Structure formats: structure tokens, C-alpha cells
């Protein structure tokens, strides 16, 4: 059985956004479904649920700000009027109960990222990091929105000694991160992909 979320994207404040959770291998006449979000770096926040019989409940803060509904194989979460406080990964998760023993949220999706901003999506700028024998080279990737980017070295063939650091939101509201690789000695190239703007950039780092 499995759960999978979709629909997260960068959206301007006030623009209604619907997320979808598609379920496989179990019935929603047996399991209750829950939406839970988590802002970058923060704790889990339960938004609401929809029981097998169709009753929907929302956290007190969420009432009037979200609507949950379902078919036989999907659950939707509509965010009525997004604000920048709504930026988070949104998870769908199923739970159930027996006689007295609550069974917990045992199955979760990988989550879908909602980014709420007045800014346009923007691809990364990539700058080479070099010293000034084996050597550590790197790439600093700056100025992108929304998250994430992926960074690989030589198309994934250099994996040993790679350290990529968590991204940091800048005061501009854009993101940056860095990646470094330890190599011996021929060209060493960082490949930075930003699917949100349909872009990839390769930078060959010169010792």
C-alpha cells in the first residue's frame, strides 16, 4: 500500500492551490486520511483529516483556511488563500483505530513542497570554489527559488568525499547552498539542476 502527494509548486499569496494525495492498496472506507505540514527546519503541524464516513476536521488555526475532500482513491487539500506562512512540505498520512488502541500514522507520502512568494522562480548562479596532491574543490550555488536544486559531481560518478550542505534562505528570499568534493590528481565538474525552472548548469572547476 502506498500514498503519494502532488501539486506543490511556487504560488503567489492569495492564489488558491489544490494538493492531491493518491492512495493505492487500501480503502478510504477503512482508513482515515490526514494532512500534515512541516515548514523548513520546524516541527510537524497537523492540518486536518477526513474520516472513513466523510466527516472532516481541521485544527483550530486551519478552520476556514483549508478544505479537505476525497474520492475513492484520492484526497485533496485546498489552500483557500495562501500566505508566506504556508510555505512548507505537505504530507498525506493514513491512520486507523481498533477497540481502544489507536494505531498511529503508519503510512506517509514523501510530501509535496509548497512555496508561497510574490517573487518569480529563478534559476541558480553557480560559482567555482578552489584553493588559494589531492584537493577539495566545490561549487557555491546562489540565488534560486523555489527549492530544491540537485548537485552532482561528474554526473554522479564522483561520490566519495562529496559533502553537500543544507541550503540557506537569504534575506532576499532566495536560496543558496554549497557542495565540496575531495579528488586526487581529469576535469571536475559540478552539475546543478533546478527542475522548477527547467534548467541545468554544469560548471567545470579549475584547480
Amino acid at each position: 500500500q502506498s500514498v503519494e502527494e502532488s501539486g506543490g509548486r511556487l504560488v503567489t499569496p492569495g492564489t488558491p492551490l489544490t494538493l492531491t494525495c493518491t492512495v493505492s492498496g487500501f480503502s478510504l472506507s477503512t482508513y482515515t486520511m490526514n494532512w500534515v505540514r512541516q515548514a523548513p527546519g520546524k516541527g510537524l503541524e497537523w492540518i486536518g483529516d477526513i474520516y472513513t464516513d466523510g466527516n472532516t476536521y481541521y485544527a483550530n488555526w486551519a478552520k476556514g483556511r483549508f478544505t479537505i475532500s476525497k474520492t475513492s482513491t484520492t484526497v485533496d487539500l485546498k489552500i483557500t488563500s495562501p500566505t508566506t506562512e504556508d510555505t512548507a512540505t505537505y504530507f498525506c498520512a493514513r491512520d486507523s483505530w481498533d477497540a481502544s488502541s489507536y494505531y498511529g500514522l503508519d503510512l506517509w507520502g514523501q510530501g509535496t513542497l509548497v512555496t508561497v512568494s510574490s517573487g518569480q522562480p529563478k534559476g541558480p548562479s553557480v560559482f567555482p570554489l578552489a584553493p588559494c596532491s589531492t584537493v577539495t574543490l566545490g561549487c557555491l550555488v546562489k540565488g534560486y527559488l523555489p527549492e530544491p536544486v540537485t548537485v552532482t559531481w561528474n554526473s554522479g560518478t564522483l561520490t566519495n568525499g562529496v559533502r553537500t550542505f543544507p541550503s540557506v534562505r537569504q534575506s532576499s528570499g532566495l536560496y543558496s547552498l554549497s557542495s565540496v568534493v575531495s579528488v586526487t590528481s581529469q576535469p571536475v565538474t559540478c552539475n546543478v539542476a533546478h527542475p522548477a525552472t527547467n534548467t541545468k548548469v554544469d560548471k567545470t572547476v579549475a584547480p
Binding site: 516541527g43 497537523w46 481502544s100 570554489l129 588559494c132 550542505f165 543544507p166 554549497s178
Partner: protein
């Protein structure tokens, strides 16, 4: 409204030791309570349901207890692979809920100490040309925590600095850290020697370059 109060916000334990996490409900939730573990990048994983029952495949090193309004998760024989954030969650009601999950508890596991390997990278010419530069300093593979001090011709820098630290490594408990110093190209050209100083305990490691 139903409120869950989880304490402490952070706890540390030596490898092999024991960690205890408490959860207080604002009313009697009758053991309709679960515990989860979560590591960055992943959804949470159910550990304990019905307050004290182990979820399928979960290790008996995790132990849930309590009743009424007071619950506890204990982790025995703590290992680096346990470094994570832990959450309690009430499944008693969906009505009049302020928060269903506790605030979470970060568990820091103290494994074998390791001194940081430090590197500094001057901004590339293509950075300077944009009007703003970012100098990068990294401290790789270390435990326990370090402090970074930036110095520009010997003057301690107090602004323009951002630090980004990885989660603990699941196998060996270590961190990696990147620290950046961001200045205007003019500000950058206004000076000669740039220094990253990384301190662990009382032992310091210094890397510098001359612009």
C-alpha cells in the same frame, strides 16, 4: 482545546546511554498516543502506537509508557543511527485541536570525538564581477560542536556571516559545517587577509588567504 507539550526540546546522550522524552496532554487522552522518529529529508516513521506498543519491525530499545495526561518515550543503548527528532502525537480526538503533535525533541548522540578538517575558498573572479562576494569556509567531519570566527586583517567580523550545519552522520555522529562571509566587491577589495578560525573546546584551527 487539546494541547500536547513535549519536553525537553533537545537532549544529548553518550553512545550506549539512555534518552528520556516526556509528553504532556492538556486532557486525558486515554493512551491514544503515538511516537515518531524523523530525520531530515524523510517523512516521520512510526515507532510506538497505543502509547506502548511497538510498531512492526521497530526495535525494543524504544519504549513507550504512561497514561492519562503524561507519557514518556525512552531510548536505550543509544546509537549514532538514533540521532533524529522525535515527536509525540495524540490520536484521541480530531475536534477542537490546537496542536495534535508535540513540538518535537532533537536527540544528539555523543559518539567518538573528531577534530574538524577546515578549508577556505576565496571568491572566484566571476563572483567579484557581480558586485557581491561570498567567501566560504568549511569544517568537515567533526564532533562535538565548533564555533567559527571570521577575521579580516585581524578584525573580528560580526556581520555578513551565515552558518549551515548538516544533521549528525548516522554511522559516526559527526557534523559538516559551511560558514560564509558575504561582502560587497568594494568592501572585499578594501582589505587583504581573510581568516576562518574554527574552535572546538579550546583547540583552534585556522585557515587564511591574502586577496
Amino acid at each position: 482545546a487539546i494541547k500536547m507539550t513535549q519536553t525537553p526540546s533537545s537532549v544529548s546522550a553518550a553512545v550506549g546511554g539512555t534518552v528520556t522524552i516526556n509528553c504532556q496532554a492538556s486532557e486525558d487522552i486515554k493512551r491514544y498516543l503515538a511516537w515518531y522518529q524523523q530525520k531530515p529529508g524523510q517523512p516521520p516513521k512510526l515507532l510506538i502506537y497505543a502509547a506502548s506498543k511497538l510498531a512492526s519491525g521497530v526495535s525494543s530499545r524504544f519504549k513507550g509508557s504512561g497514561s492519562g495526561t503524561e507519557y514518556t518515550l525512552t531510548i536505550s543503548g543509544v546509537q549514532c543511527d538514533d540521532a533524529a527528532t522525535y515527536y509525540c502525537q495524540q490520536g484521541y480526538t480530531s475536534s477542537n485541536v490546537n496542536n495534535a503533535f508535540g513540538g518535537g525533541t532533537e536527540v544528539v548522540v555523543k559518539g567518538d570525538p573528531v577534530a574538524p578538517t577546515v578549508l577556505i575558498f576565496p571568491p572566484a573572479a566571476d563572483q567579484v564581477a557581480t558586485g557581491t562576494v561570498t567567501i566560504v569556509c568549511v569544517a568537515n567531519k567533526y564532533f562535538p560542536d565548533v564555533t567559527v570566527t571570521w577575521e579580516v586583517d585581524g578584525t573580528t567580523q560580526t556581520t555578513g556571516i551565515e552558518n549551515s550545519k548538516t544533521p549528525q552522520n548516522s554511522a559516526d555522529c559527526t557534523y559538516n559545517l559551511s560558514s560564509t562571509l558575504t561582502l560587497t566587491s568594494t568592501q572585499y577589495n578594501s582589505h587583504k587577509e581573510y581568516t576562518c578560525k574554527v574552535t572546538q573546546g579550546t583547540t583552534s584551527v585556522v585557515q587564511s588567504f591574502n586577496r
